[PDB]
Each structure stands twice: as C-alpha cells, then as structure tokens.
Amino acid sequence: ALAVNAWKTTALKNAIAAAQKAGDAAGKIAGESKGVETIIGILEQYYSIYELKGTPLKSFFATTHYTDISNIATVIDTELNTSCGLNSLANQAICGLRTKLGLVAKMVTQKEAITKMITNVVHKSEITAEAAKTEVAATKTAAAIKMNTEAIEAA
C-alpha cells in the first residue's frame, strides 16, 4: 500500500498542525479570561480596590485592557487624589492604598509607587494568563491529535 501510506503521511502531518492550532485557539481565549480574572483578584484581595470610575472592576476591564498599565495607573492615582484629600469624606476604601504603598520616609511620589505596583500586578496577571493558555492549549492539542490519528490510522 504505497499510495495509501503516502496520503496518510500527509494527512497525519496536517492533523498535527491542525491539532496545534486548535489548541492555540482555545488557549488564547482561556488566557484572556484568566488574565482579567487574575488582576481583579489581586486588586481586590491584596489592595482592596473593588471599583474604579464608580464601577466594579469586571466592568472597568471591559473598556480598559488588563495590561494597559499606564491607563490603569493614572485612573488609580486620579481616584486616590479626588477621594482622599483633606476635603474628602467617609474613609473611602481606596484611601487605604496609601499605607499599602510604603510611602513613609526611610524618595517616591504617589504616582511612582502606583506605577510600580500596577506594573508588578500586570506582570503577574500576564504570566498567570500564559500558564492557563499553556495548559488549555496542551489539553486540547492532545485530545485533538489523539482523535485525528485514530481516525486516519483506522481509515
């Protein structure tokens, strides 16, 4: 069976490349979800930031990308200033961020500490997203190539 093995040879090469692209597609989507999910989790537990611009973080990160450090940092810095000045009220939740950012003199502005904090947070959420992408891509690829090889070897 010369002609039979020749086409199965090409079929299997294509099945491999298809199962990898199927895995990447699924992992890419899994990564995006996991990244947004991770930054929200960090800001809420570690920094008790539960809203920005009057809205829950889930809504905020629909219009601001979770990796957009410069935008995220500016919004947090602006919100601290408008909510936590001497004319401000009510012990707003975001005001606690100042103590969490180690500003006391032991030389960093508030905006600089926030920028480093968010850079740190975004880096952790990107690599956590990358891990989820890696797992989901591998699980899908394994299941796809197994299914496809068994088909070609049985045809």
- The residues, ordered by sequence, that sit 6+ positions from 23 with a Cβ below 8 Å of its Cβ are 136, 137, 138, 139, 140, 141, 142, 144
The total domain count for the chain is: 1
Beta bridge partners of 51: 56
Position 44 in a domain: yes
SS3 label, residue 107: coil
Closest CA to 142 of 9, 18, 23: 23
State in Å, rounded, how far the first CA of the chain is from the last one: 13
The structure was resolved to a resolution in Å of 2.2
Position 3 in a domain: no
In which domain, by residue range, is 148 found? 22-154
Residue 83 in contact with residue 105, Cβ under 8 Å?
no
Position 91 in a domain: yes
Position 105 in a domain: yes
- The residues, ordered by sequence, that sit 6+ positions from 73 with a Cβ below 8 Å of its Cβ are 111, 114, 115, 118, 119
Beta bridge partners of 149: none
Q: How was this structure determined?
A: X-ray
Position 5 in a domain: no
Position 57 in a domain: yes
- The residues, ordered by sequence, that sit 6+ positions from 94 with a Cβ below 8 Å of its Cβ are 49, 76, 79, 80, 83, 84
Number of C-alpha atoms within 13 angstroms, CB side, residue 113? 15
